[PDB]
């Protein structure tokens, strides 16, 4: 805290409580006692615990029939109204679409739909599988996830 | 009907003005105006002006008659004080308060 190291008043004789600094955290405009610093909040996950959670998550989606498997999911033009009409036919509104390799048409058609995220098989994470109401996997993404999960 | 007049930020302590205001509480206005004339207090000059002011409001704004009006309510509130410095012996300094008041007078024929 900006200031001086001067003692505000003499140690004895003034009838006031002892002070040694105006930067004391007891004083108004003084320092914080245990002031923060920037810190790193990241934890470690063992590889086997990370992969084990995906298998528990993945098998729960099947058990709760929140997982849907196709081999056909693409759009002919990068148009948001095309993907939105496709999803209307399938009765999906909040959905995570996982594809073998991500197409540019499907990536661009879904950017403006906030309830829809489209991912490659390499980019699935635990939190997104639990967040979305339904998960749609192409049967070539269903392939690649199982080799990744050993 | 009741009619109000105030003097806000009147320059006098409320304790000094309260002595005068207790003299006319509940009096007829003709009687209270004569009491305030013959009181040798500065606050009696302040209190009388508010009393004359409230009487005029009753006639002009409310169609009241002088002969019926009576001092129904009167009270003095503390106002903000102004803080000043007075220097004392041996380098010490004191804080002087210049106290003010709010004077409110309500007249009514009922």
């Amino acid at each position: 805290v900006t200031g001086s190291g001067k003692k505000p008043w003499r140690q004895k004789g003034t009838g006031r409580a002892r002070s040694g600094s105006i930067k004391s955290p007891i004083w108004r405009s003084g320092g914080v006692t245990f002031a923060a610093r920037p810190q790193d909040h990241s934890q470690k996950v063992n590889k086997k615990m990370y992969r084990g959670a995906l298998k528990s998550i993945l098998s729960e989606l099947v058990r709760q029939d929140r997982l849907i498997v196709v081999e056909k999911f693409s759009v002919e033009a990068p148009k948001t109204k095309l993907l939105a009409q496709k999803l209307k036919d399938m009765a999906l509104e909040d959905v995570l679409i996982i594809t073998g390799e991500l197409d540019e048409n499907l990536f661009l058609a879904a950017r403006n739909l906030h309830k829809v995220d489209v991912r490659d098989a390499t980019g699935i994470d635990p939190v997104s599988l639990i967040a979305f109401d339904k998960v749609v996997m192409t049967a070539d993404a269903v392939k690649q996830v199982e080799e990744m999960l050993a | 009907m009741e009619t109000i007049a105030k003097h806000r930020h009147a320059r006098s302590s409320a304790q000094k003005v309260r002595l005068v205001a207790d003299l006319i509480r509940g009096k007829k206005v003709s009687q209270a105006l004569d009491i305030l004339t013959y009181t040798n207090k500065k606050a009696a000059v302040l209190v009388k002006k508010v009393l004359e002011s409230a009487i005029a409001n009753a006639e002009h704004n409310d169609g009241a008659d002088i002969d019926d009006l009576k001092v129904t309510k009167i009270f003095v509130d503390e106002g903000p004080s102004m803080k000043r410095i007075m220097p004392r012996a041996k380098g010490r300094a004191d804080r002087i308060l210049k106290r003010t008041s709010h004077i409110t007078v309500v007249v009514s024929d009922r």
Binding site: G13, T14 | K90, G91, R92
Partner: peptide
């Protein structure tokens, strides 16, 4: 300010040595 003059004076302060 400084101490009161009677609190500095030895005669007043030092009455029980």
């Amino acid at each position: 300010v400084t101490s009161k003059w009677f609190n500095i004076d030895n005669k007043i302060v030092d009455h029980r040595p």
